[PDB]
Design an enzyme around this catalytic site. Structure first.
Site, PDB file in Angstrom:
ATOM      1  N   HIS A  20       0.780  -1.666   0.156  1.00 28.93           N
ATOM      2  CA  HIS A  20      -0.480  -0.346  -0.001  1.00 28.93           C
ATOM      3  C   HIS A  20       0.512   1.218   0.093  1.00 28.93           C
ATOM      4  O   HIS A  20       0.269   2.224   0.791  1.00 28.93           O
ATOM      5  CB  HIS A  20      -1.254   0.133   1.329  1.00 28.93           C
ATOM      6  CG  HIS A  20      -2.027  -1.126   0.535  1.00 28.93           C
ATOM      7  ND1 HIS A  20      -3.316  -0.803   0.661  1.00 28.93           N
ATOM      8  CD2 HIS A  20      -1.972  -2.422   1.566  1.00 28.93           C
ATOM      9  CE1 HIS A  20      -3.858  -1.915   1.270  1.00 28.93           C
ATOM     10  NE2 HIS A  20      -3.310  -3.029   1.359  1.00 28.93           N
TER      11      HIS A  20
ATOM     12  N   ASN B 157     -10.228  -2.410   3.212  1.00 22.61           N
ATOM     13  CA  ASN B 157      -9.634  -2.512   1.598  1.00 22.61           C
ATOM     14  C   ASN B 157     -10.878  -1.890   0.751  1.00 22.61           C
ATOM     15  O   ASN B 157     -12.130  -2.140   1.549  1.00 22.61           O
ATOM     16  CB  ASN B 157      -9.209  -3.764   0.758  1.00 22.61           C
ATOM     17  CG  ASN B 157      -7.791  -4.343   1.812  1.00 22.61           C
ATOM     18  OD1 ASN B 157      -7.182  -3.670   1.975  1.00 22.61           O
ATOM     19  ND2 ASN B 157      -7.694  -4.967   1.003  1.00 22.61           N
TER      20      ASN B 157
HETATM   21  C1  HDD Z   1       0.372 -10.408   8.421  1.00 24.00           C
HETATM   22  C2  HDD Z   1       0.739  -9.275   7.302  1.00 24.00           C
HETATM   23  C3  HDD Z   1      -0.299  -8.771   6.493  1.00 24.00           C
HETATM   24  C4  HDD Z   1      -1.406  -8.881   5.885  1.00 24.00           C
HETATM   25  C5  HDD Z   1      -2.235 -10.914   6.070  1.00 24.00           C
HETATM   26  C6  HDD Z   1      -2.883  -8.046   5.659  1.00 24.00           C
HETATM   27  N1  HDD Z   1      -1.675  -6.981   5.911  1.00 24.00           N
HETATM   28 FE1  HDD Z   1      -2.125  -5.120   5.581  1.00 24.00          FE
HETATM   29  N2  HDD Z   1      -0.344  -4.169   5.759  1.00 24.00           N
HETATM   30  C7  HDD Z   1       0.242  -4.872   6.353  1.00 24.00           C
HETATM   31  C8  HDD Z   1       0.453  -6.092   6.915  1.00 24.00           C
HETATM   32  C9  HDD Z   1      -1.014  -7.207   6.300  1.00 24.00           C
HETATM   33  C10 HDD Z   1       1.790  -4.578   6.995  1.00 24.00           C
HETATM   34  C11 HDD Z   1       2.973  -4.749   6.236  1.00 24.00           C
HETATM   35  O1  HDD Z   1       2.246  -4.190   7.594  1.00 24.00           O
HETATM   36  C12 HDD Z   1       1.529  -2.483   6.042  1.00 24.00           C
HETATM   37  C13 HDD Z   1       2.697  -2.094   5.522  1.00 24.00           C
HETATM   38  C14 HDD Z   1       2.537  -0.406   5.975  1.00 24.00           C
HETATM   39  C15 HDD Z   1       1.701  -0.683   7.321  1.00 24.00           C
HETATM   40  O2  HDD Z   1       1.508  -0.004   8.510  1.00 24.00           O
HETATM   41  O3  HDD Z   1       1.269  -2.354   7.678  1.00 24.00           O
HETATM   42  C16 HDD Z   1       0.286  -2.474   5.627  1.00 24.00           C
HETATM   43  C17 HDD Z   1      -0.600  -1.658   5.547  1.00 24.00           C
HETATM   44  C18 HDD Z   1      -1.992  -2.086   5.231  1.00 24.00           C
HETATM   45  C19 HDD Z   1      -2.668  -0.909   4.518  1.00 24.00           C
HETATM   46  C20 HDD Z   1      -2.683   0.684   4.277  1.00 24.00           C
HETATM   47  C21 HDD Z   1      -2.213   1.129   5.795  1.00 24.00           C
HETATM   48  C22 HDD Z   1      -2.469   2.906   5.130  1.00 24.00           C
HETATM   49  O4  HDD Z   1      -3.232   3.423   4.223  1.00 24.00           O
HETATM   50  O5  HDD Z   1      -1.212   3.610   5.808  1.00 24.00           O
HETATM   51  C23 HDD Z   1      -3.682  -1.718   4.482  1.00 24.00           C
HETATM   52  C24 HDD Z   1      -5.027  -0.876   4.077  1.00 24.00           C
HETATM   53  C25 HDD Z   1      -3.995  -2.584   4.814  1.00 24.00           C
HETATM   54  N3  HDD Z   1      -2.713  -3.280   4.858  1.00 24.00           N
HETATM   55  C26 HDD Z   1      -5.287  -3.357   4.579  1.00 24.00           C
HETATM   56  C27 HDD Z   1      -5.149  -4.660   5.224  1.00 24.00           C
HETATM   57  C28 HDD Z   1      -6.323  -5.596   4.320  1.00 24.00           C
HETATM   58  C29 HDD Z   1      -7.513  -4.657   4.226  1.00 24.00           C
HETATM   59  C30 HDD Z   1      -6.159  -6.980   4.424  1.00 24.00           C
HETATM   60  C31 HDD Z   1      -6.725  -8.429   5.093  1.00 24.00           C
HETATM   61  C32 HDD Z   1      -7.935  -8.959   5.385  1.00 24.00           C
HETATM   62  C33 HDD Z   1      -4.570  -6.511   4.850  1.00 24.00           C
HETATM   63  N4  HDD Z   1      -4.011  -5.334   4.831  1.00 24.00           N
HETATM   64  C34 HDD Z   1      -3.768  -7.923   5.461  1.00 24.00           C
HETATM   65  O   LIG Z   2      -1.312  -5.479   3.434  1.00 22.41           O
END
Ligand code: HDD
Ligand SMILES: [O]
Ligand code: HDD
Ligand code: HDD
Ligand SMILES: *[C@@H]1O[C@H](CO[C@@H]2O[C@H](CO)[C@@H](O)[C@H](O)[C@H]2NC(C)=O)[C@@H](O)[C@H](O)[C@H]1NC(C)=O
Ligand SMILES: *[C@@H]1O[C@H](CO)[C@@H](O)[C@H](O)[C@H]1NC(C)=O
Ligand SMILES: *[C@@H]1O[C@H](CO)[C@@H](O)[C@H](O)[C@H]1NC(C)=O
Ligand SMILES: *[C@@H]1O[C@H](CO)[C@@H](O)[C@H](O)[C@H]1NC(C)=O
Ligand SMILES: *[C@@H]1O[C@H](CO)[C@@H](O)[C@H](O)[C@H]1NC(C)=O
Ligand SMILES: *[C@@H]1O[C@H](CO)[C@@H](O)[C@H](O)[C@H]1NC(C)=O
Ligand SMILES: *[C@@H]1O[C@H](CO)[C@@H](O)[C@H](O)[C@H]1NC(C)=O
Ligand SMILES: [Ca+2]
Ligand SMILES: [Ca+2]
Ligand SMILES: [Ca+2]
Ligand SMILES: [Ca+2]
Ligand SMILES: [Ca+2]
Ligand SMILES: [O]
Ligand SMILES: [O]
Lengths: 688, 688, 230
Positions: free
Chosen positions: C63, C136
């Protein structure tokens, strides 16, 4: 590859392990029962996700979007009467290299074909240390003092409030800066000519920009400009084609390089220097310390030193390309700096910035940054210390380690040394040299030297860009500055953007020229890696068969034929859905495909009886042909394929439009002629 | 050593270079003339100073002060019917090791001989992954849940306002926490007995603390406590002698280990386990999941598995010792966790904290953290990526890399696996187990089992510490809690600190004991590395000669004689100025040196006519002898040297005071007897 | 806006200063004479360039490409019989918000209109703590266990050797993963329908995706799916 292969991890036919060599599985979290909560004691989960969570590093502050390749340098001579540099010490001496090409303004993931200055950074892994020439594809830079870099870059990069626009100068701040700081004008013209939108990294030259010193073992110096003269040939786009490429393939130039190397079509450049004397700093009418000025080759020829060939792609892009950390301070005995205030401050920046990228001080220990020469010094510790120093007495002068490591200087140990006759004189001051004040004569030199079409391309770029400048004050200030270069240029731009035509100011007007300075006007030297899109039909198998025939006639020059058809039938390379004119240096309609190119194909209602294809958007075949023509490409048609040209209102009487009986040698010869010309400039209107 | 030697930098007889292999000099900044300003273009200056500026990394959040050594483990059996752990798979099987010993509270420059719990962290570089047993020299810990760790450590570490006091529990917050959280009492008694102030890292045992599981290939488990049984023998200081050592040699214990290894006196420990059944968790009157509880050896003996020997010092302390990053999550097939809430949360902390120390995710790539087993996985990138992964398809399940790396689990590839009969049951909750609530019976067990002198040492430590507690509420709360252990302990401590003598509270009083649990009360097993300071005089050459004679009679048991005299004459090892009782395990007055020990020597006025030495402080020789005596050390005198004993009011009739005619075998035998006893406990008063 | 305004720097009609409040100029390096070398003692040059050199931080691992806006939430009821959440405790109760919309695969300079799942992350700055629903524009996700996240993302993101292609699933690894891990198919269909290529962030819905619990003060629960109905 001996050196880097020690760090390779081969994961063919092996069991999965943790980072500490414990065999593991990694597909299900540990839970309390079948549908239970995940346990904290699941170290396999946490190590895997921790590595993932921390994959990213800061993108480079500039030149974030780029692409690298390994290669080799070959010296053409023993240059010891010019320089003590080891890599230049003998005819045939070879040195490994790594090169990274880039844009400047855009972030990671921005389009390759944004209009911009391009980076052209070359590392020589010499036997007497790493030597980097951190250059660009344009010989002049926007600003005359490194302290202004944040001003230039903040103005060019996206607005501070909303981070718009990505990878573009087409906004108020950029043009505010350009007009407020007219030193920018020379680079601006280069970038808004074809040099800002090259076809590939193989079809540009490189430049060190600054005047450097070469210095012999006995301390004798010359002033030089460094050049990389490309052996493929300059080739560039028109803006609307670069935009369309950004939408269809953001990776277009990186992909071109990768594929060309995989195909064995290794691009080459000759390293050259314009050799000058210490006494030449002001004699030419401009200051050699001023990075906004070129030395025309009419004044000082390029002496060719040797050749670079790029010939191996990285194994892992992140490890090798993302992590390569270039520095102009990576200098070797036999080269020295000059007092160019832009170079002077670069030296500070490139050492400092790697702390941001790597997160600590030991960035030179990364495989891609390591030298191919011994390291012996009293530097110690820091996060990420990968070596284990055996000397417990890390200081000079010592007796406890018998006076080692020993001092190396001009007379012993082949040390680096500053050219010994350089001097300083004068009051300490923060001032702009009066020798730097002509911001307009060289822009005019450049402008005068262009073919008519490329003058037009500059005008049309500036018209496009400034029409997006909201501020009337900025628009007016831009025209006033352009008018000091040329009243013709200024007038032509002003007419698109609602600014009154300016009165001439003859202060800097002149009619001098320098040869072949634009991106347009010369035939290509090599056709390697260019593509011919053959538009065929699965309903006429003979049309598809023409691909291999045409290919046999084009292979000897390194040109590929790509067969395009409605679906992936045998011997089809791409589908119409997946294809676009911007993929192809030439577009040819195959004999039998003409039925796909009807003039009503864009707008016919796709009723169940219509015969409209669901395999591609309405009009796609004809759109590819028309876009190829309008963008200036070689266009052809075989046999009755020529009917498609009639449908598109394209006459073979036009230059760069070719017909033939069949896909044999006669037609291939004509397509080769077209490709060598590359772009047919008579398809672009020019102001009168 | 083969593995780490690949990262060695040998700097014998070589020229200095930059970190990218350019030969350089590094002793003068580049200046604008002889007395000019330093130039920005001096890249040599800046790369040198930037490395310097960034040398430091965060100290460990706990156990910051510590010392490391390499060694080897040898298994005594094929333990496959107990555990699948590969390093235990065969009699004779050798595995490399690295071990770090430490205190807990002090920052990285604090004194070795602070009173504290000590770390005992042992890494096995096994052929199926790194396995770390991150233990301490005390078998029980202060708290029962990892979530409490910041509470314990914030209370023990310096006050938040002024960062006082360093490396000490003798302040209000620490004792506030101990009294508010009586789980602490068991470890507190251990640390305030001799175990808090050991003579050396070679003279302690180690413990894993938690109950772990051992697991066979077919999933059968035992519950175990890990032990490291030292083969040198427990030896500890008294408080006053630990303090004096902190002032005289902050590196005393680090120095002891380094020297012992350089001398070939390699310290050893046997790895052992107390082997228990799953059904034993609540059978013994306490919970095996509770880390504040020991399993007495009378209930479950220690089964010995193999031996660790430490036998090589690091080559570079920073690269090896400072950067080693232990984790209980470095576990291998054949071992598993238990639901001890302290262990459970440790697993999270030690993976997370290395991010702080390393400044990025690739800390397992540091040489000292690397495994000696293959690594193959889909983890990628991160700052400081030292490897170059060849597989561009880093995901499972894949076909593009033919399904590799392949999952490893119980039945294929020797994967780690959680013991398969482990279950969870019950409501999700944040609660303290009721099985954890007896905080006092085992501290009373420990107390009952000490010789009277070591009970007195605990009392005297607590009197010293709590006299430094300002809060009356805290002092009273401490006495209340102590009194639930033992009315005797509580009464004895209360009388120093203005708290009323408590009335008995007998709920947890009992008379049980466990054998040899204190630091005091057994003779040493080996005398290796112990030191006899022979106090001699340059004015009586024969006194100095006794050194070599005595040495000859003590070499066979690894004991060194250090000759002390006024100045560095032939055969003198140390000057009086440079010496202190705390350097020596035994102190002996040489025949002829007695003249230096006059009873008026502390206070004589050092006038021109007095013959007072300027080579050492007034009274130094007698001070060394008196301190040695008062501290409990072996003391002796040769020949007329016994006059010095008289001057110091030390009778040879006392235990641990020996006189000899000469420096021959008879006297050497008495000195060995004294060293074996180590401390003469009759010199310490005991409550009545 | 009161809260964030305390951190605003207004630079209208003022003199330039260093980061420690010393007035400065910043347009010419200090040189040894008019055409001389730049001096190390030029602290103005170095503080300016050091800030520049260190401007960047790692993009989000996923993202990375996104856009934010401030706003407000207003509760339509007293929801205390369903949940103890304070931001839902009364009809009319207002809570400040910050929301970020995004794609998933592309790096931070990639095109807005790449085909992808889109993030819809909403923060409520509630009076009992920050509450984030990190959602999402599609209600279902590709995989069933968080441990698979690096597999999914490594397959979708650019190839490891050449970092091609940007912000796209149209390459072998992605489709290798989708076909090997058919849990992916629901989200795949959503993303390859119009939901992958929305006209604007205003013309999508949001979803929490997971089932969560709402809990009253007396411990009673409901299972819920969160929705943002545009
Ligand atoms: C175990 C790993 C993992 C999993 C399975 C998911 N995410 Fe994620 N997501 C992350 C690990 C992650 C992260 C690596 O932790 C991020 C990258 C930047 C952050 O702050 O978190 C992130 C970012 C991130 C963002 C951006 C937020 C922003 O605008 O700063 C969104 C909207 C989502 N995620 C949504 C989801 C959705 C709806 C998921 C499933 C239902 C999902 N993610 C599964
Ligand atoms: O994510
Ligand atoms: C004082 C600031 C400054 C100025 C005036 C310049 N640069 Fe720069 N440049 C940097 C500060 C910088 C930097 C912030 O230090 C970067 C970003 C990443 C890096 O390693 O250095 C960099 C990157 C960078 C790269 C990318 C190297 C790579 O591929 O990793 C190239 C090719 C250039 N620069 C080229 C130039 C040219 C030819 C310049 C003018 C003649 C120029 N830069 C002026
Ligand atoms: C939840 C927090 C926590 C808890 C309850 C404990 N530890 Fe710890 N310990 C850490 C969190 C931590 C740490 C913050 O993660 C450290 C600091 C440096 C490191 O690598 O880990 C550490 C270091 C550390 C070291 C130093 C290793 C080295 O020499 O580098 C040892 C020997 C121990 N611990 C031993 C223990 C023992 C035997 C514990 C109880 C049975 C214990 N720790 C509980
Ligand atoms: C350990 O790993 C193997 C993996 O074996 C796969 O199992 C499934 C079901 O039989 C089958 O579809 C695959 O083709 C098998 N083979 C491979 C190489 O993938 C599991 O079968 C075991 O059950 C796992 N579990 C244990 C407890 O070892
Ligand atoms: C350098 O110069 C001298 C004198 O001109 C000449 O003898 C020699 O050939 C030259 N060296 C090289 C390597 O060309
Ligand atoms: C170069 O260094 C050598 C050896 O250290 C020294 O003795 C000699 O004087 C130096 N010469 C110069 C040019 O400074
Ligand atoms: C070309 O440049 C020379 C070099 O300074 C200058 O003197 C001359 O006037 C110029 N001629 C034209 C046509 O501008
Ligand atoms: C393990 O157990 C079986 C049965 O007791 C026996 O055959 C064998 O001796 C044992 N093996 C080892 C490794 O001691
Ligand atoms: C003390 O030990 C005896 C063993 O004889 C045991 O039966 C008893 O339960 C123990 N009591 C306490 C309070 O620990
Ligand atoms: C909650 O429930 C009770 C019983 O149904 C009722 O008294 C009340 O109306 C409800 N309160 C709210 C906040 O709606
Ligand atoms: Ca200047
Ligand atoms: Ca024609
Ligand atoms: Ca609990
Ligand atoms: Ca004293
Ligand atoms: Ca005696
Ligand atoms: O740059
Ligand atoms: O710890």
């Amino acid at each position: 590859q001996q050196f880097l292969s020690q760090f390779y991890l081969n994961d063919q036919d092996v069991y999965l392990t943790s980072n500490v060599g414990g065999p593991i599985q990694d597909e299900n979290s540990l839970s309390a029962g079948q549908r239970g909560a995940t346990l904290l004691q699941d170290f396999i989960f946490r190590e895997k996700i921790q590595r993932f969570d921390h994959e990213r590093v800061p993108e480079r502050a500039v030149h974030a979007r780029g692409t690298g390749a390994h290669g080799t340098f070959t010296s053409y001579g023993d240059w010891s009467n010019l320089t003590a540099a080891s890599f230049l010490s003998a005819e045939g001496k070879e040195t490994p290299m790594f090169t990274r090409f880039s844009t400047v303004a855009g972030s990671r993931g921005s389009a390759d074909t944004a209009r911009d200055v391009h980076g052209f950074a070359t590392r020589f892994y010499t036997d007497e240390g790493n030597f980097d020439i951190v250059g660009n594809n344009i010989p002049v830079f926007f600003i005359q003092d490194a302290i202004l870099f944040p001003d230039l870059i903040h103005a060019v990069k996206p607005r501070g409030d909303n981070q718009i626009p990505q990878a573009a100068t087409a906004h108020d701040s950029a043009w505010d800066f350009f007009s407020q700081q007219p030193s920018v004008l020379h680079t601006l013209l280069w970038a808004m000519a074809g040099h800002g939108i090259p076809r590939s990294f193989r079809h540009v030259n490189g430049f060190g920009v600054h005047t450097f010193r070469l210095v012999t073992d006995d301390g004798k110096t010359k002033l030089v400009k460094f050049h990389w003269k490309g052996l493929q040939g300059k080739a560039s786009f028109v803006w609307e084609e670069a935009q369309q490429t950004a939408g269809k393939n953001a990776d277009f130039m990186r992909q071109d390089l990768f594929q060309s190397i995989q195909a064995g079509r290794f691009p080459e450049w000759e390293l050259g220097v314009q050799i000058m004397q210490e006494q030449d700093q002001l004699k030419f009418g401009f200051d050699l310390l001023d990075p906004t000025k070129i030395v025309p080759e009419e004044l000082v020829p390029v002496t060719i030193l040797g050749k670079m060939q790029l010939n191996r792609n990285p194994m892992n892009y992140f490890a090798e390309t993302e992590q390569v950390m270039f520095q102009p301070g990576h200098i070797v005995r036999g080269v020295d700096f000059t007092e160019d205030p832009l170079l002077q401050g670069r030296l500070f920046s490139y050492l400092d910035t790697q702390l941001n990228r790597h997160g600590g001080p030991n960035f030179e220990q990364l495989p891609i940054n390591r030298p191919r020469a011994p390291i012996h010094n009293n530097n110690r510790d820091g996060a990420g210390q990968m070596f284990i120093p055996l000397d417990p007495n890390a200081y000079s002068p010592n007796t406890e380690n018998k006076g080692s490591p020993k001092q190396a200087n001009e007379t012993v140990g082949k040390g680096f040394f500053t050219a010994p006759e350089r001097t300083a004189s004068g009051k300490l001051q923060r001032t702009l040299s009066t020798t730097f004040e002509n911001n307009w004569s060289q822009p005019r030199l450049f402008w005068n030297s262009l073919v008519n079409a490329q003058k037009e391309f500059i005008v049309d770029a500036m018209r496009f860009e400034t029409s997006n400048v909201s501020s009337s004050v900025v628009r007016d200030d831009v025209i006033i500055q352009l008018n000091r270069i040329s009243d013709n240029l200024a007038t032509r731009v002003a007419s698109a953007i609602g600014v009154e035509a300016p009165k001439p100011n003859s202060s800097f007007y002149h009619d001098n020229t320098t040869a072949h300075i634009g991106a347009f006007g010369e035939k290509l030297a090599k056709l390697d890696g260019l593509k011919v899109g053959l538009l065929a039909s699965v309903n006429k198998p003979a049309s598809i068969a023409q691909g291999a025939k045409l290919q046999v006639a084009l292979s000897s020059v390194g040109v590929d034929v790509v067969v395009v058809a409605e679906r992936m039938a045998n011997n089809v390379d791409e589908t119409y859905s997946a294809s676009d004119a911007v993929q192809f240096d030439a577009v040819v309609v195959a004999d039998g495909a003409e039925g796909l190119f009807g003039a009503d194909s864009f707008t016919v209602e796709p009723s169940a009886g219509s015969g409209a294809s669901t395999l591609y958007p309405a009009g796609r075949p004809l759109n590819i042909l028309l876009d190829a023509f309008r963008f200036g490409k070689t266009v052809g048609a075989l046999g009755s394929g020529s009917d498609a040209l009639e449908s598109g209102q394209i006459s073979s009487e036009r230059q760069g439009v070719y017909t033939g009986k069949n896909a044999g040698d006669a037609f291939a010869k004509d397509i080769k002629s077209g490709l060598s010309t590359f772009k047919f400039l008579d398809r672009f209107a020019v102001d009168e």
